[PDB]
Design a protein around this ligand. Structure first.
Ligand SMILES: CCCCCCCCCC(=O)OC[C@H](CO)OC(=O)CCCCCCCCC
Length: 235
């Protein structure tokens, strides 16, 4: 219904079409961090002197659903509990039940001015085309303009295109005998395409990326595990 619907649907379809391709066999990507079930890749890209390195991570998390993962990732009410790089943020506008515009500032992750970001964050269920395939839950976060948050002089305005894309594998048990969290696994794909704005050394920016993304993914996924443990399953 809202004014960004076409852009949202374009971004979701783009992530659905391009972001789920396996980069493990893609020789243009490099596996830069591995820990447990998590693998983090990047493509070294510069355009007009500036580092744009697309990043993609895959992960598989026992005992949670894509719905829960995406709920926790999207829900502003719980951002503080898991996110570490954010200094301040607020919802600038509510577009829909599932779509919000967020303004936020980031703590310095390299010695420079703080970055701010203004993005639409939407949570979407993508229906399976068949009952044999998992449904996909996706949270897309992408930079937008808003009259109420113009560029300011204290921060550099970063531009983002980020998605977390989740599918739930369920393996029904034997017996009589309900499915438990032991019977479920959430496959995650996380993509971040970020323009840091301004200027910074390629080497520091690449070091920060390699540090901050696996840190976030480990902390966030274990957080969803803790918060859902023992609770009825939200498919
Ligand atoms: C350059 C280093 C990047 C820092 C790593 C960011 C980890 C935050 C994880 C994340 O995606 O948060 C999702 C949250 C939920 O809607 O929305 C966000 O906070 C989007 C964050 C995008 C990263 C901005 C990087 C620019 C700062 C210099």
């Amino acid at each position: 219904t809202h004014r960004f619907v076409q852009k949202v649907e374009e971004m979701v379809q783009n992530h659905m079409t391009y972001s789920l391709q396996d980069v493990g066999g893609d020789a243009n990507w490099q596996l830069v961090v591995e820990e447990g079930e998590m693998k983090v890749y990047r493509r070294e890209v510069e355009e007009n002197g500036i580092v744009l390195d697309p990043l993609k991570a895959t992960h598989a998390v026992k005992g949670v659903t894509g719905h829960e993962v995406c709920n926790y990732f999207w829900n502003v009410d719980v951002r503080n509990d898991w996110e570490t790089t954010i200094e301040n943020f607020h919802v600038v506008e509510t577009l829909a039940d599932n779509a919000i515009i967020i303004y936020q500032t980031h703590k310095r992750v390299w010695p420079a001015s703080q970055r701010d970001v203004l993005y639409l964050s939407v949570i979407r269920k993508i229906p399976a085309l068949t009952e044999n395939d998992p449904e996909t839950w996706i949270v897309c976060a992408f930079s937008v303009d808003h009259d109420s948050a113009p560029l300011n002089n204290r921060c550099v305005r970063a531009k983002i295109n980020v998605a977390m894309i989740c599918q739930t594998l369920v393996s029904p048990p034997e017996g009589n005998q309900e499915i438990s969290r032991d019977n479920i696994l959430c496959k995650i794909t996380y993509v971040a395409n970020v323009n840091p704005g301004g200027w910074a050394p390629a080497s520091v920016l690449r070091a920060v990326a390699k540090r901050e993304y696996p840190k976030f993914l480990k902390r966030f996924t274990s957080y969803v595990q803790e918060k859902t443990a023992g609770k009825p399953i939200l498919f």
